[model samples]
Target: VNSFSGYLKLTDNVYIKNADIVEEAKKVKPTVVVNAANVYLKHGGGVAGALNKATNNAMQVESDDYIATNGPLKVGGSCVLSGHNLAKHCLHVVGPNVNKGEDIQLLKSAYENFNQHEVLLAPLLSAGIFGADPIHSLRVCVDTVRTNVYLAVFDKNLYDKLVSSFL
Candidate 1:
């Protein structure tokens, strides 16, 4: 249901796409779709919520079970779960919230967690409610992701801004 406007290649392996990440994940069926998750693994808002809905809340239940078994995820920490109707797997990561005194390295760590996955579908970490500037988050993502990745941005304006800089 989502359209891909275009893509900007950041590196040999990373591509930034102007597309709905959720839809792209289903279509591409990547090795993993990185979720912009919270420490508590609550897929209640942001990218987490959208992906959870796409999976019919199956991801939410698995997240709950993960927390129940392993306790809360730490900032910059990650966990893998079934992607259900989406990708092969979902790599849930907790990025830093700027208001909470967390910094860019935490966001960097979030992207670094996906190094093992060959095909990655992800969004701009910490750029929404988490309060990271989109450009900064994009930079962190491009810098950390060393493999094949499709970074999705739902907003056309934001996508233009991102692509303009590289163009």
Candidate 2:
């Protein structure tokens, strides 16, 4: 489903990507997968659901526990969960949903905190069910995960538009 798949050269290494993030994360084993979660870490919906299944709920349970014990998660804060299908760690980020905002910056912080890794699989923060402007979301991702190679996994329509805009 990828159109113009490539590496966005940000800081010497490649940055942005428009492809199958999960498969790509597998290729780069022990990949740090980003869970597009809510404050309560509800992994039962949309992309979050996919991540939950992919990790066999390993990531999901961790997120749930964290939120329950520590109150609602901060927009920029994250938690790391281990064990599951194809990941060394799943970084849980409290993303902005359709009923949320203050996202653009919050998303940036989430990516920023996880920048310690070499290969990470993160989507365009909230470029999906939340009705986020894909272009804006991608830019926020670039600002944080730009140094290391990470997947800015967006769907086909956004992918085409994103790559085209790089010109």
Candidate 3:
């Protein structure tokens, strides 16, 4: 199951044993949480703004685990998933408006998060809906999470990608 950001207006497809975010959170017991926002200048293009608004609407909160920084986690063409300087052990790659072939790179970064036993929650964005075919993205995601990762798919059609591959 996947969750959508009501504020950002972005969709994500997650494939996990169970189809619940809170449940996954509880089971994973992630030390850190990385929430992915929509790509800059796309869709709402105001994740920071939305987050600020969400914080304002909420009551008193403790801990500074929630913070936003604008930058790329990795550089160059080839890199690995590394959670070296993250506050929490998890990282989230939120949305991709177009198919830029960045899923592999993002997956590499996610793997780095996995190596540290950090929970990496990412969304399958337009790749399955608007941009490139969902199958391509699912293939990459499935290959990346051979053992250490959990996934959820919000779009049922996207499942065909996985089904076609195995049975």
List per-prediction Cα lDDT, in the order shown. Answer: 0.83, 0.66, 0.36
Q: What TM-score quantifies how close candidate 3 is to the native fold?
A: 0.42
Supply the global lDDT for candidate 1: 0.83
Best-first order by lDDT: 1, 2, 3
Query: What's the ranking of the predictions by TM-score, best on top?
Result: 1, 2, 3
Top lDDT prediction, candidate number = 1
For model 3, the local distance difference test gives 0.36
- Comparing candidate 2 with candidate 3, which one achieves the higher TM-score? 2
Question: How many backbone clashes are present in model 3?
Answer: 12
Candidate 2 C-alpha lDDT tens digits along 47-129 = 67876777677777777777678887777777776636766777777655545646455667766766776666677777677
Query: Considering lDDT, which of the candidate structures 2 and 3 is the better prediction for this target?
Result: 2
How well is each residue in 91-122 modelled by candidate 1, as lDDT tens digits? Answer: 88889988788876788888888787877788
Clashing pairs in 1: none
Name the weakest run of 10 consecutive residues (lDDT summed) in model 2.
1-10
**Model 3 C-alpha lDDT per residue in residues 1-167, reported as the tens digit of each score:** 22222212111323433133333344444454333333331222232223223334221121122222333323211112222222233343444434455443454343333334433444332343335455555555555543334443444455444454531
lDDT comparison, 1 vs 2, better candidate:
1
Candidate 3, poorest ten consecutive residues by summed lDDT: 59-68
